[model samples]
Target: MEELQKSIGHKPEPTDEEWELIKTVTEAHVATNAGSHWKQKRKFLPDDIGQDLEAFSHFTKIITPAITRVVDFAKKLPMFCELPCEDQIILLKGCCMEIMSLHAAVRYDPESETLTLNGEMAVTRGQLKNGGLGVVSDAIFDLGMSLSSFNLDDTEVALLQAVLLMSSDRPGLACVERIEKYQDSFLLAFEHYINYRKHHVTHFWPKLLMKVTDLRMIGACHASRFLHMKVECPTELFPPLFLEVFE
Candidate 1:
């Protein structure tokens, strides 16, 4: 993270105040109940096979809350409110799924290498490919595999969220300079954490950064699949917020 700040040219290090604020915002958001209800039981029935609406309905049900949670998660972050209202909406709409994709690491089952929605619902990489997720599943599985190696803790996940939230070059930002300041702060903090864990091999920083790129690509894939699948899903099954995020 130290080198990262330099690579982008000269930028001031986070003030002690900013450093503590970064820690506070990241930790607080993690403890918030915004996304806590999302790990609900999925309704993926074996009989739903070949039933497009059934499968997509289950998909909508699972993601709709998670999507809403991500929005609420953003609202809870003190750092988030610092941005202009329009920028807040733009950032949330643009990067929600990327943050969600990073959060999705928790749902990856290393023992099975499967993406699990809950104890009862999981999808194999092969299953994703076979289910006509088409290219979308490939990105999803790539993120899971890349993230599985880290076994990220709560703080690490929060750190990634800060970076994801602030890193986006979202259009119409009222204060690009302010946003850059926060982005640098979070990156520096994450770098500090990595150094603190010097007992581990120092190889992961690069790998971790690469995974963020994967998250963005997968976010686009998710948005594409989401819109394509939305046409087939009933409006009643879709959350109103879910519709707004993509459009």
Candidate 2:
């Protein structure tokens, strides 16, 4: 039995402090369980009017605040603050969209077909499609639905964010080994937490981890689409943070 468990890569559960940190940061920074009281009142353009610059500008406005929250969340993670300032910026710039997409997935409510932003603004699929983000928006919503099917709670969501943020492979990273170590620790914590929370569900951890790749692909698509938008619509001013983080 010991050999079987060891060979299967069973890990110890997160310590009290780690668990506390994950939960606290999640509650503070993540949008899980956030309720949207305001109805989506914005008007959308026709389907044929794909990728409207005006609508895309509005979309950027809605998501910019969430991007800042992702930055704040990363700053709070253990070991992240210890990194060099330049490396910190590089990491955030590299993974901001992935984290943002994951956050959007967490906040997505399938029944209502709306993604609530920080409990304030709620946007529907139609609105997103009308905003010149039809392809990327559909991809994110699909990813959100997949994540929602897993029924991940806040701690799980936060741990995923931590793991994604600490990825060691981002280009221009100064301390690859150190970021790898940080990511390893978070990955272990996430694995153990999944084991503890969903022991009966086989392969749940691996399946959830797969979403990380999906997030990366979606993030790339978002970046490329945004770049295309900038070229196609030169007059519109994108949020500075959006430009800095993704462009």
Candidate 3:
């Protein structure tokens, strides 16, 4: 899986043929996860997709050459090294899954109420959460929106809690209104969520897949807010955005 985990987000330029090859591999991998049998089973679905393959191909034609792009971009603002290695993985996996979800959701049909991954009708809670977050984000897109405007889909909240806890090196937060409230309900809920997803993957791969899904939910919500307003959120933060966000 060198091609899978290798950094491929940076690229100055890529030839047309190189792009095509990435697309081919990505599509093949994504296709492998298709069919109703797999979806009903709820296991580690393939992260690859047609548009994703195309995008990955276009962005990172050569693995070694692509490191410059990721490293260079990361150096500009918050230094990548500031984050722990586990945090780095969470962010990388989060961003990757967000791209895949975007591609899949964009093809959705409102009338048919359906979307397909690799030629079979496929839909998941993450897709529904994205839709819900889009609605809430639009309503609060302006100065006219209320401070009491915060709301989240139940599914999104569950997914988000799971993703946030995966990077366990977070600052203090706990339930029962301690210095931090996340420790009680949210963390316990996450353990249950992992167990639920893990029962299907046959190995640890399912945990990885679920985290990617959770991250995508978070990324989608953040991107919607960013597009609508001048956002300055601490991405993947643990202790809450502001004291008001938790209160």
* Per-model TM-score on C-alpha atoms: 0.79, 0.83, 0.24
Model 1 regions lying over 4 Å from their true place: 1-19, 33-51, 118-120, 126-133, 230-236
Local accuracy of candidate 1 as per-residue lDDT tens digits, 1-247: 5467669754444567656755776665566434444445533346434324555555556676667656766776777788888888888887887876665556766665666642345666655555535576767777777677687766677777778888547777777888888788777777666655442545677878887788778777877777676565346776677778877
Q: Which model scores highest in TM-score?
A: 2
Clashing pairs in 3: 173-180, 174-180, 174-181, 174-182, 174-183, 175-181, 175-184
lDDT of 3 by residue, 1-247 (tens): 3233327622122234423422332233333223245234423223332212232222222222222222222233222234555444444433432433322343333333433332333433333224223442232221112111222222323233223333333333111132123223333343334343333333333434454444445455655543443333333322222112222
lDDT of 3 at 223: 56
Residue-level lDDT of model 2, residues 1-247, one tens digit each, is: 4347768876556678667766755665544333343334423234343335655655667777778877888766657888999889988987888887776667777777776544455566766767766677888888888777788877777788887788788888999999998888777778767767864556787788789888888877877877767776365467788778875
**Ten residues in a row with the worst lDDT in model 1?**
42-51
- Displacement of the residue 36 alpha carbon in candidate 2, Å: 7.9
> How many angstroms is residue 238 displaced in model 1 relative to the true structure, after the best TM-score fit?
2.9
Off by over 4 Å in 3: 1-88, 113-247
lDDT of 3 at 88: 49
lDDT of 2 at 188: 72
- Under the 3 Å rule for N, CA and C atoms, how many clashes does model 3 have? 7
Task: lDDT winner between 2 and 3, please give it.
Answer: 2
In terms of lDDT, the poorest run of 10 residues in model 3 is: 142-151
TM-score result, candidate 2: 0.83
